[PDB]
Amino acid sequence: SILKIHAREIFDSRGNPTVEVDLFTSKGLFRAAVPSGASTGIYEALELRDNDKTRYMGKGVSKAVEHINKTIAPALVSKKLNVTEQEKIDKLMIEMDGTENKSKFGANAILGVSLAVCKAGAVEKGVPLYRHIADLAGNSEVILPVPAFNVINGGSHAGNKLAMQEFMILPVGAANFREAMRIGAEVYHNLKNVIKEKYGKDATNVGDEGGFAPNILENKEGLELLKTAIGKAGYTDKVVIGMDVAASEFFRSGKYDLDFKSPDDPSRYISPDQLADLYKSFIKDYPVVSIEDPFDQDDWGAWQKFTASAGIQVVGDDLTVTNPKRIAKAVNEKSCNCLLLKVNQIGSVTESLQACKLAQANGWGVMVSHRSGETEDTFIADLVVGLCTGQIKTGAPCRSERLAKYNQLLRIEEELGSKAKFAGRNFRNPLA
Amino acid sequence: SILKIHAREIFDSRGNPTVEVDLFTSKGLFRAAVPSGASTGIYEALELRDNDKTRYMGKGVSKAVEHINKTIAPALVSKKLNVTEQEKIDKLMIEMDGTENKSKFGANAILGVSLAVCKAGAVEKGVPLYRHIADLAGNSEVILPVPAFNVINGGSHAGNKLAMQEFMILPVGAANFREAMRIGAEVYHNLKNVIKEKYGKDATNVGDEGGFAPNILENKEGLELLKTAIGKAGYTDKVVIGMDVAASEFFRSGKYDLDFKSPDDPSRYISPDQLADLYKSFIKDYPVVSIEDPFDQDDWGAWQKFTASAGIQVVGDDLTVTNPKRIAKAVNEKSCNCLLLKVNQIGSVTESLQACKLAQANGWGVMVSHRSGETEDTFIADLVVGLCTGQIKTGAPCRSERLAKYNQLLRIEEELGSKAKFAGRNFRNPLA
Numbered sequence: 010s011i012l013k014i015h016a017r018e019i020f021d022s023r024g025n026p027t028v029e030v031d032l033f034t035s036k037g038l039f040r041a042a043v044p045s046g047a048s049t050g051i052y053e054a055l056e057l058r059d060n061d062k063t064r065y066m067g068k069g070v071s072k073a074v075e076h077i078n079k080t081i082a083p084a085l086v087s088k089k090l091n092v093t094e095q096e097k098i099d100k101l102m103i104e105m106d107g108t109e110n111k112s113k114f115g116a117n118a119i120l121g122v123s124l125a126v127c128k129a130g131a132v133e134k135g136v137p138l139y140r141h142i143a144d145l146a147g148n149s150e151v152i153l154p155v156p157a158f159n160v161i162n163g164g165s166h167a168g169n170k171l172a173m174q175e176f177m178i179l180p181v182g183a184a185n186f187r188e189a190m191r192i193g194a195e196v197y198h199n200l201k202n203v204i205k206e207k208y209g210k211d212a213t214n215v216g217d218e219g220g221f222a223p224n225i226l227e228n229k230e231g232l233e234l235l236k237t238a239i240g241k242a243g244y245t246d247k248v249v250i251g252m253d254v255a256a257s258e259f260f261r262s263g264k265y266d267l268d269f270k271s272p273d274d275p276s277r278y279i280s281p282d283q284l285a286d287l288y289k290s291f292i293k294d295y296p297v298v299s300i301e302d303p304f305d306q307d308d309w310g311a312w313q314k315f316t317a318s319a320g321i322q323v324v325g326d327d328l329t330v331t332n333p334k335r336i337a338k339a340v341n342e343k344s345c346n347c348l349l350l351k352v353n354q355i356g357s358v359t360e361s362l363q364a365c366k367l368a369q370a371n372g373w374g375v376m377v378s379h380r381s382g383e384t385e386d387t388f389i390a391d392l393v394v395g396l397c398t399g400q401i402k403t404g405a406p407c408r409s410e411r412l413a414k415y416n417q418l419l420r421i422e423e424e425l426g427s428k429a430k431f432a433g434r435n436f437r438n439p440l441a
Numbered sequence: 442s443i444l445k446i447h448a449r450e451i452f453d454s455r456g457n458p459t460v461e462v463d464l465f466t467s468k469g470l471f472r473a474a475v476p477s478g479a480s481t482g483i484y485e486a487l488e489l490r491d492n493d494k495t496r497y498m499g500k501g502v503s504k505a506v507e508h509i510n511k512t513i514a515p516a517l518v519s520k521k522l523n524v525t526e527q528e529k530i531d532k533l534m535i536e537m538d539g540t541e542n543k544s545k546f547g548a549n550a551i552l553g554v555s556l557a558v559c560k561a562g563a564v565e566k567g568v569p570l571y572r573h574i575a576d577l578a579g580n581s582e583v584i585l586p587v588p589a590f591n592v593i594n595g596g597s598h599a600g601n602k603l604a605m606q607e608f609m610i611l612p613v614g615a616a617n618f619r620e621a622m623r624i625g626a627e628v629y630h631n632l633k634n635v636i637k638e639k640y641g642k643d644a645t646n647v648g649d650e651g652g653f654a655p656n657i658l659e660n661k662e663g664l665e666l667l668k669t670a671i672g673k674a675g676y677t678d679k680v681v682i683g684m685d686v687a688a689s690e691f692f693r694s695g696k697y698d699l700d701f702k703s704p705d706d707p708s709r710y711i712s713p714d715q716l717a718d719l720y721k722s723f724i725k726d727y728p729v730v731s732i733e734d735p736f737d738q739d740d741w742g743a744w745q746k747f748t749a750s751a752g753i754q755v756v757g758d759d760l761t762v763t764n765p766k767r768i769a770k771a772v773n774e775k776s777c778n779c780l781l782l783k784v785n786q787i788g789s790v791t792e793s794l795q796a797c798k799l800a801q802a803n804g805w806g807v808m809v810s811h812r813s814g815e816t817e818d819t820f821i822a823d824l825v826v827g828l829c830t831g832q833i834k835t836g837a838p839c840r841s842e843r844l845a846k847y848n849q850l851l852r853i854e855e856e857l858g859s860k861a862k863f864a865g866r867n868f869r870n871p872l873a
């Protein structure tokens with residue numbers, strides 16, 4: 010039923026080239042774009058870049074776009090495969106590439122087509138995208154997730170000293186998704202005043218994901234700022250905190266550098282035990298219920314040890330790279346208890362759904378996520394609703410590559426009407 | 442032909458509520474959202490806010506949304522008007538409001554419907570949106586504009602002392618629009634390095650429009666940084682500079698405060714002649730070919746005098762507020778020679794086309810513009826192409842509420858194919 014496929018190079022939220030794909034069926038035009046991370050784990054599927062230093066400093070994706078236009082498209086159009094057959098189409102592309110990490114076509118090439126196919130399939134079935142995703146995942150129910158707003162940005166997403174990547178607020182106590190958005194927005198604007206009053210205007214600019222970028226070095230101060238803003242907005246009893254440390258970014262041959270954005274000096278590196286002690290104090294002093302990538306993507310011993318004594322949600326991101334094989338190892342070792350789901354870390358809609366079901370079958374929570382490099386595409390909004398994970402992180406309530414997702418979730422809630430369910434306090438596992 | 446209209450509150454790029462409208466015809470659903478400025482001139486049509494300080498700091502727009510749902514929608518649905526009749530529909534709404542500045546419904550309520558009607562009209566005719574706009578404007582030819590990227594932010598859009606609002610680069614020398622995008626992005630990325638090297642990473646976070654927000658005070662330094670980035674990127678031959686002073690933001694009882702973000706002190710204020718000479722020095726030392734709002738919105742004397750002696754494009758923004766009545770006075774006094782076109786400053790597509798035509802008929806250039814508070818809506822991309830103005834400013838190539846428009850422009854150029862035209866160095870008057 011695929012009449013035509015055409016790919017093109019567009020710009021992501023950081024001004025870098027990325028892949029966009031147009032797919033046509035008798036039902037019309039279906040478009041999707043591909044996100045790109047900044048703190049990408051070594052095990053992520055290959056994001057194929059041109060590496061032509063004269064063009065976009067080597068970041069062009071004309072090669073990936075060409076693999077689609079010259080190879081994937083003609084093949085998919087010939088096979089006359091129906092758009093509702095996501096798995097068959099994804100497997101075909103995976104077989105055509107033939108590599109473990111999608112290094113021939115590029116995961117960005119295959120995902121772009123994979124996403125466009127998924128949207129087309131939904132329309133073909135005459136049902137909303139989230140309902141289509143739900144059918145593909147075998148879910149009867151659908152639910153609105155608690156949003157996790159990254160309101161203070163650090164690490165590789167901002168020009169400050171702050172080593173840890175993301176400081177998030179989750180309105181688990183909200184009555185529904187629209188109130189969750191209200192809480193998120195009001196806390197964010199109050200936080201702007203709190204930071205301005207304490208650090209000045211120069212501290213109120215934003216990072217890649219829309220969070221403020223005060224030039225502080227202390228991660229604890231970031232948490233204190235959140236606590237103050239939450240209090241000022243009056244939602245202390247409805248908001249908990251989440252963090253993405255992105256520890257692989259400051260891993261230094263066994264130790265960790267919490268001041269990695271300053272000229273290198275080994276005298277300040279700390280051990281994973283010392284790093285864990287810091288997390289323990291955070292959990293003690295603030296309502297931190299979730300920590301993502303607390304250690305390096307392959308520092309397996311530290312992960313197991315911390316999760317065993319933590320009491321909270323521990324999210325694997327670079328550890329698991331939305332990859333069934335890495336996830337399975339993590340489940341067996343009890344490395345963590347939550348999967349960060351990033352479709353472009355594995356490269357296809359089908360594999361992403363398999364990663365999600367694998368995590369869930371093992372009792373893990375799943376948090377759907379954007380990449381620091383986003384586009385106006387809103388696929389993940391329907392994805393998290395259809396997969397019923399109950400949690401999604403897709404930015405601070407600032408910069409439209411983030412609001413496009415939150416806005417779409419508002420539209421999904423409205424469409425669901427009075428029967429719309431919201432994860433709320435059951436965000437870790439809206440099932441049970 | 443309008444079957445249903447339903448409005449809702451969504452979020453803009455700053456995380457503030459704004460209006461979104463869904464409009465249905467037998468051809469389907471058409472959706473549009475409304476932008477919101479920060480440095481808004483006093484003569485702009487009313488952007489209606491709820492002013493309930495307990496909700497979104499007083500910035501909700503539920504009243505505007507209600508004006509559409511309980512008043513405008515049923516009126517339009519009853520009249521059974523054809524969506525291609527833009528002028529009749531806009532006029533009906535203007536008449537229903539009955540006020541000079543659309544303060545009964547709010548310009549945001551009227552514009553939301555106006556835009557959605559326009560999008561439905563194009564599909565009704567089975568023609569691309571820019572073509573429909575071309576038709577409504579009475580244009581046969583269509584052309585890609587030169588993009589003006591606000592790559593360094595100041596004034597009310599950034600956290601720094603920098604008083605002047607926007608520092609833009611225009612790749613007038615590009616071969617086509619896509620190369621214009623490539624040049625814009627490459628210079629932007631080179632600039633991040635130039636700033637980082639001189640002021641450190643903390644100076645590379647971004648303001649509301651995606652431009653870097655360095656901690657500097659001197660506007661000349663802003664220009665100097667752009668020049669360095671342009672040279673470093675190797676495009677000194679293809680890039681010129683534009684500025685948006687937004688002088689109305691620092692107008693102080695007759696004089697001007699170039700440090701208005703620091704604690705007040707009249708002793709630092711300068712006179713309009715001093716400000717005019719400062720611009721002239723800028724025009725002398727840098728490739729500045731365009732300056733927007735060099736003086737206060739009602740400092741008519743200074744405008745006329747400067748426009749007559751500067752030798753460059755002088756853009757009226759808060760001076761004209763996309764208002765034919767203000768524009769008429771400006772043409773008669775030769776207050777400026779270019780119109781900044783902001784649909785939300787007047788409130789309807791029709792008045793916007795009228796304002797554009799009035800300016801163009803008088804030899805004025807016209808630069809289509811976004812607002813500092815944007816959404817994922819891409820209407821102005823088709824608008825500038827359909828109006829053949831030859832120039833558009835819709836942000837730095839950072840933050841998707843900006844790239845959504847640029848990406849759409851890339852899709853239009855692609856769709857136009859071999860017969861695509863680009864204003865290039867003739868941006869001020871693309872159709873000779």
Ligand SMILES: [Mg+2]
Binds near residue numbers: 047
């Ligand atoms: Mg990461």
Ligand SMILES: [Mg+2]
Binds near residue numbers: 048253255302326327
């Ligand atoms: Mg991460």
Ligand SMILES: [Mg+2]
Binds near residue numbers: 480481687
């Ligand atoms: Mg302004």
Ligand SMILES: [Mg+2]
Binds near residue numbers: 480685687734758759
């Ligand atoms: Mg302006």
